[model samples]
Target: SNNGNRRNYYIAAEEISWDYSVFRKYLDSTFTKRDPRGEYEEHLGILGPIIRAEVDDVIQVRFKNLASRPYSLHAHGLSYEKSSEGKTYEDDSPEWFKEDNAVQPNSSYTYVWHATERSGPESPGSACRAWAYYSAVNPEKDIHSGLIGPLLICQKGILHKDSNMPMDMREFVLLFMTFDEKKSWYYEKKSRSEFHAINGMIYSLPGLKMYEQEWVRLHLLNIGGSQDIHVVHFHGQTLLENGNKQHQLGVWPLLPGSFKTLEMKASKPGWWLLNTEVGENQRAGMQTPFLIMDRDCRMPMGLSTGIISDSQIKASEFLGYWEPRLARLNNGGSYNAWSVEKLAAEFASKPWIQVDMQKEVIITGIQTQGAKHYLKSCYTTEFYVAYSSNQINWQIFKGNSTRNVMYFNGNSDASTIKENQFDPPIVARYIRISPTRAYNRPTLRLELQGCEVNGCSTPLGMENGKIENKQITASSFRARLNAQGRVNAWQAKANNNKQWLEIDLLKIKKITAIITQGCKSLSSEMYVKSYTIHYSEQGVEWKPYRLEGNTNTKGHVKNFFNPPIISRFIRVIPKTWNQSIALRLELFGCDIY
Candidate 1:
C-alpha cells in the first residue's frame, strides 16, 4: 500500500517451482522491493508466465482465481472451440456453456488450446511467433485489473528442449500498452496512480544485452486500447519485416490487437535508445536503453611500436638562398632546417609543410624546433598539425599547436631554440604543419614518433584509406557499383534536382574529417560541387555539420571539424552538381572512450 499498509489483491500465474520458493516466500512477507507495496503486491499488471508450444501441439492451462472478483482467461491467435473459449457470455443453455462462465472467486477452470497451422508463425519455417493471453471476464475491466502475458508458438524442429527459444538467435518480447488508471478497478481505491508503460512497468526495465554480429528477433504486441498507436523505433540498427530481406526498416507501427515479429542483424556496438515515437507517451517514460558490446572489448591501436624515421617531408615554399631540403627536418640535425620566405605573397596564403610516412602508421608524438642557430627572425609563433591516411583528406590533431613564442635572440646559439612536442597521438599516413602566424623568415625542424602496433591502425569505418564499401547507401541506386566504395562512385538519376547519400559507420565514433572525390572518369559533369553533411546518433533526428568555408571543389575536397563530433549515421546532401550529383566519400574518426 502507498500509505505503508498491508493488503491483499487478486492475481494468477504458472505454478512456481521449488527453485522460486525462496522468492515466493519473500513475496508473501512484508519485504518491499519497490515503493507503495511489497515486492509482489503490484496491481493492474498481474502478468502470467509465457506459455510455449510447437505447431500441431496442444497447450493446457489450469487457472485458479484467488481474488474476490470473478475472472476468466482468453487466448488470442490460438485455435479454441466454444467449450474451451474462456470468455464470459449470457446464453439460454447455461449447462452447455458453463465452461465459458466466469469462475467465482476461489474456483478454478481448465483451458485447452490447439496450436494449428493458422496459429503458428506466418512464415512456415520461422522459429516462433508471438500471441497473447489475458483475462476477459469483464474484458476491459479484467484486463485493466491486471492479467496478461505472452504465448509463443514455434515451428517443428525449432524449439529447444532446455531453453524455450531457438539456439541460434536471441529473442526479445515487447508489449506496448497504456495502463489507464481511470479504467482500472484500482482507480477508485488508488486514484493518484497512472502509468504509460511497456510490459506493465513505467520508466525502468531490464536492459537487453548482445554481442557484435549476432541475430536478434523481436516480438512486438499492441495490447492497449484503440487510441494507443505505437511507433516502435530503434537506434543504431535496422530490422527486416515479414521475411522481406531486401529493404531494411527503422520503425514498426503497431495498432491495437496487432502482433509483429521482426529480425535484425546486430552489426553496431554501443548503448542505444529504444522507445516509442509518441511524444506524450515517451515523456511519461516509455523508453529504455539497449546495450550492444564488442565481442572482445579490446583497444584497436597502441603507441609502443617505435619512431617512424624513414618519412618524406615537403613544404609549400622556402627562402631562396636559405632554402633547405625537406630531408633536413627528420635528419636529427637541429641546426639544419626548412625556412619559409617572409614575403607579402607568402603571408597572403597560410604557408605549410607536409610529411608522408610512406605507409599508414599510428602517430603519438611530434617534435619541432624553430630556427635560432642563424637568426631569431626565422621562427614560427603559431601553428597547427593535421594528419591523414590519404593526403587528400586531413584531420587536425586536437590541441597540437604552438602560440606566441620566440625562436632566436642576438646570441648566435642553437640552445636558444625551443623544441615543442605534442602527445596523445593519432593515426595517419600523412602529416601537415600549417603556420598561421610567424616572425621573420619562419624556419622549422621537425620529428615524429609513433608505433606500428595494431592499436595504432586505421579508424574503424574506413578500409584501404577509404570509407567501407558496404556501408554506403543512397536515396536511390542506378547501378550496384555506383555506391560500392571509394573506387566506384554513386550517381543519382538524371533530371533529379536533389540527391543525398548516407553512410552507416556501424557504431558511434568521434568524427573529425570528411573527404569527397569527384568521378575518376575525368568528366566534371558528374561531380558534386556544393553539399551539406549531417550526422545522427539515432537515425530519426540529424544534426548538420557547420562548414568553415567553401568545401565544394573539383578533384578532391576535404573538410575538417575542430574538437570533433560523435555519431553513427552520416549523410550528405548535394545542393548543386555538374550533372546529377555523383561522388565517392570517405570519413575519418576514432572510437568513443
Candidate 2:
C-alpha cells in the first residue's frame, strides 16, 4: 500500500540558468549567477513550485537527489516521521533513517507526511494556508543557493470539485526577504551586496494578475535572516489578514517565520504598487507593480491618487483667479494656487481651507506647497489641522504631546513641496487646514495622502520640498530631475569630485534628509556611489559636511545632515561614480520665514 489515503508528488534537486547583477563595484564578480540546486524553482525564476495538500491526506513525496552536493527535502506544517524529517542532526536515529536525511547525489529518498486538521487554516483565514519548503542540509548554506518553495495546505474538497481546475479562486504566492547575495555560493561582492527582492525579482513579482472583486489570496513568506523584518504594504486596497474580517490591514509586519496570508476581495482597478513600509527598502528596489483589472479585464483609465479633488476644496477667501479649486498638489501653472483674500495684511485672522474625501479613509499624511499673490511671494511657515467625519463635530489634530495644540512647519518659498504625516492617522471624511502662521500670507497648494479606512499602508512623512529645476544647476546638464525631452537625470561634465551640483535655497532652512534616484534610461545603468556635501550661507565661503566627527557622505542614501544646516546654497561634490558622475536628486529642507 502507498501510505493509504493519498496525495503524491515528486521533487528533484537540479540545476538552472539565472542572473542578477550590479554596476558600481568595478569588479564584475556577481554580474551573472547560476543555481545548481532545485528543479521546480524555474517556474518562478528563483522560487520553488507550490506543493499542494489537504486535511486528512498523506503527502507522499518521492525525492530524487539529482543535485551535485548532498541534500534533503524538508517541509513545514505537516506531521513527519523520524525518517522523513529530512533534517540532519546529531542524535542517531539509525543509519537507515539518516539516509533519508541527506539523500546523497544520484540517490533517491521517499518521505510521507500526514496532514491533519491542524495543518489547515486556523479558523480566521481562507480555507487554504501556506508553509514554505526548502533544502534541509545546512539550510543557511544551501537555502541561499535558491532552494525553496511554497507548500499549500487547505480544507479538503475546497481546492477542486469535479474538473481538475481551481475552485473559482486565485492565489499568488510571494517570498519577501532581503536575499543576501554574499551568502550565495557563487556571489562575491567587494563590499557585500544584498537584494531586497519580492519573489526573487527586484521591482515586479512575475505571474501576478488579478481581476476586480475577485476573492484573491496572497500567500507571503519571509524565509530570510532577521533584520529582514519586512512590512507588507498594498496600495489602493485593504485586506483581511487571515480572513478574520475582524480588523483589516493594509500593512502587516512580516517576521522571519511568521508566514502571512492575505485574503482580499480585489476592488480597486489600477496598476498599483505593492511595497514594503521600510523606506530604505522601497528605494532599494523593494516595491512590486501589481496590476488589477476590472471584471471586463479592461485597462485602467483613471490612474489617480488619494487627493479628493480641487473642486472639493473650500477656503475662507481668495482672489477671483486664486480660487480654492486651484489648490491642487504639484500644480505649477500661472500663479497656480489659492491664497487668502489679500496678502500678508489678512494674516492675523488665520484663514483656512478644507476638503471632502467623500468617504471615511485613514488619512495618513498631507503635502503642501507655497503660492505667490500679486507681485509678492507668500507662504505659510506653520499650520494646524482639524478632522471631522460629519459637518458638526470637528476635532483639531494634536501633536506628539500631552499638552497644547500641535502646529506643523510649513513652506519657505514658492515651488517647494512640503509633506507631513499624521501619527495614529485620522479616520475622517473631511480634513481642514488653518494657516496658523506664515512667511508672508496663507497661500498654498495641497494634497492628502491615505487609503481605505479599515486598513492602509503607513504614510510617508511630509519632510521637505522638491527644489525646482530653476534652483538646481549642474556642472553638466544633459539630464536632470523634471528635465524636458526626457533628459532623465544629471551627468557631470567629467567624472570626479571637481564637478559638483549646486542648489540655491534662496536662504538657509532646516534641512532634514536628501533623497536621490539614479539616471533612468534604456541605454545606461548608473548612479552616485558616494559623495561629499558642502553648504554656504553666502556663495563665498563653503564648508564640506564632514564625517567621523568631521566625516563625509558615503552613498546615495547618505544625503541629509544633522543640526539641520543653515545655508543659502548647497553643493554636492561627487567623489565616486560608475564611469562619469551622474545624479537625479532633491534638496530636503523646511521653509524659512
Candidate 3:
C-alpha cells in the first residue's frame, strides 16, 4: 500500500535538491542527496565522496574548498606522510608539509593516503573495515558545519576494480550525525532550527532497495561529536559480525568519530527501518527505510546445471502418516508428505536428512520450505546443514549458521514460505540437514543445488599413512588413524613437541587439493596450530609447498594447488602446536596422466 510513497521517498532526493540556503552573501553550503552510483558520488552534500581502496592501494583525493571557511580533508585509520597530514601543528614542518594546514578557501590541496595491512578488515571473509574522512581545519566547528564521509579499505578481492565498491550484491553507506542548530553555521548565523540527520539530510535520507536473499554490506559511520554515541538497530533483519557465523547481533554501537561494517542477508521481504535505537535520535530523524522486494524464481549460480535431478535424497525419518518422498520434495510441492521429519524427539537429538549427489559435485546452495499442514507454522529454528563427499567425514556448512536458518518472529503463517541461500559454495556429494531446535516439528522439504566439476578424480594417500614416530609407546594415538576419513580418528602426541605425518599414495598422483579437519571435540587442545606440507615423487627428494598463513584447527580447511602437483609421498610438518600435533587429513586429485 505504501510502495509508491516509499519509492518517492528515495526518488525525491535524487530528482530534486532539498537544499536549505541559510546564508545569501556566502554561497549556500547545502546538503544535497544523490543516488548511490556504485560508489559515493563526486558531490555528496556536506560529506566528501566515499574513498575506497584495497589493502596496499594508494588513495589520492583532490579537495577543492568551495566553502567560505578554510577547510582541509583529513582521514582516520589510513597512513599518511607528514606532507599529507591535513592538520595544523606547532612543531617545525617542511614547507611542503605546511601546505596541508588549513587549505585556504577557494584553493585546493591533494591528500595522499595509504591503505596498509592494518587498515584492512579483521579477517578474510569479513567486509571492508570503515574509516572516516572529514574537514578538520576547526575539528569541532568544521564537522558540525557539515563535512564528513566514509573511507573503506578491504582485502584485495572484496571490491570491484572500476567501481571501487564492495562486490557484495548490495552496499549502503550511512553517516549518522546529530546537528546541534546552535553549533551548525546553518542555524547559528541564520537563526534556523537545529536537527539530526543521516548523510546530512533531516527526517529520512534515502530508501535502500534490495531483492530477497541478496547479501547487503552496510558501512556505518558516526561522525558526531563527543555526545554522539549511537546504537544502530535493524527492524526486520539481523546482522553478523565479520568472519563470525555462530552468533547474530542486533544492535551495533558507534562511538563518536568511529566507523563499522556489517553484513546481512535479506531473508525477510518487507519494508524495514535502519535506524538508531536511541529514543532522542529516532525522534530527531536519524533513520531511513530499506525495502526488500520479492525476487523472481531464479536459482543462484551453479544450480542451473540440472545435476540436482541426478541426485538421490533420503531422510532419517518422517511422521508415520506423512511419509517423506524425495520426488515430492524436488517437485516443489506445497503439501505435508513432501516434507521430512524425525518422530517426536528431544530438540538436541533430532535426526538428519541427506542428499547423495552420487559423485563429487560443485555444490552451491540448498533451498528449503516448511510444511503447511493445519494452518500453523512448521519451520525449524536451530538447525545445522553440513556436507561431505564421504558421509563419514562430515563438515558443518558455515553459511548463515551464526543465526537460525529460518526465523519468522511472529510472521509465520499458513501462506508464509521461508527460504535461505548460502554462497561462496563448496564441493561435496552428500548434503545433510539436522535440526537442533524447532518451532513446531522438525519438518522440511529441500532441493540440492550445484553442478559437477572434473578436477579431483579420486582421493589418494588413504593407505599406508603413518607418523614419524610410529613405534612410540602412545598406541592409543597412533599416526595411521590420520587418513581414516573419520572426524574423531585424529593423531595426537603427548606434548607440545613438533611432529610430522606422512602418507604414500602407492603411486604418483596429481595432487589437486588437501583437506584438513581440526579437532573440535573436547580434545581440541591437541589441534595443530601451524603446519606446512611437503611433497615428493621420491621420499628422499621432498620440496616444500608454502601456505599463505598459519592454519587453525577450528574446522575444515581446504588448500587447493593452482597447478596440480604430481607426487606419491606427502608429508605434513608441524611448526607450532596448540597443544600437540594432532590432526585428520584428506588428499584429493587424479592419478598422474
Per lDDT, the best of the predicted structures is 2
Model with the higher TM-score, candidate 1 or 3: 1
lDDT of 1 by residue, 212-248 (tens): 5777667767665657776766676776676554446
Scored by Cα lDDT, where does model 1 land? 0.49
| TM-score versus the correct structure, for each prediction | 0.43, 0.44, 0.42
Off by over 4 Å in 1: 1-11, 14-46, 90-94, 105-110, 121-127, 186-195, 243-248, 285-287, 297-593
Off by over 4 Å in 3: 1-45, 92-96, 105-110, 121-125, 157-160, 186-194, 243-247, 285-287, 297-593
- Candidate 1 matches the true fold with a TM-score of 0.43
Q: Could you say which candidate leads in TM-score? A: 2
Summarize candidate 2's per-residue lDDT along 373-447 as a digit string, tens digits. Answer: 467666666666677677676666543211112243434355555545342334466766776544445666665
How does model 3 fare in lDDT? Answer: 0.49
With a 3 Å backbone cut-off (N, CA, C), the pairs that clash in candidate 1 are 300-455, 301-455, 301-456, 302-455, 302-456, 364-425
Clash number for model 1?
6
Candidate 3: residue 21 Cα off by (Å): 12
Taking the tens digit of each residue's C-alpha lDDT, what string does model 3 give over 1-593? 01111101111111122353211011112223332321122114555355556665655454454434555667666666756556666767445657676665444233446665655655556656677666676667766765555666667654434445454455556666666656665325563223556545666554344445666666666665768777666677776666565546656776876555677777654345555578756665434555443343234321222223323344566445444443433235545423344456653236676765455544434445454556745665444566666778665543212222222121122223334443333446676666554444655545444332224424443553521223223322445444345465444555432454544334555444554545544355245455554555565654566522126555444444445566555555554555554544444444435
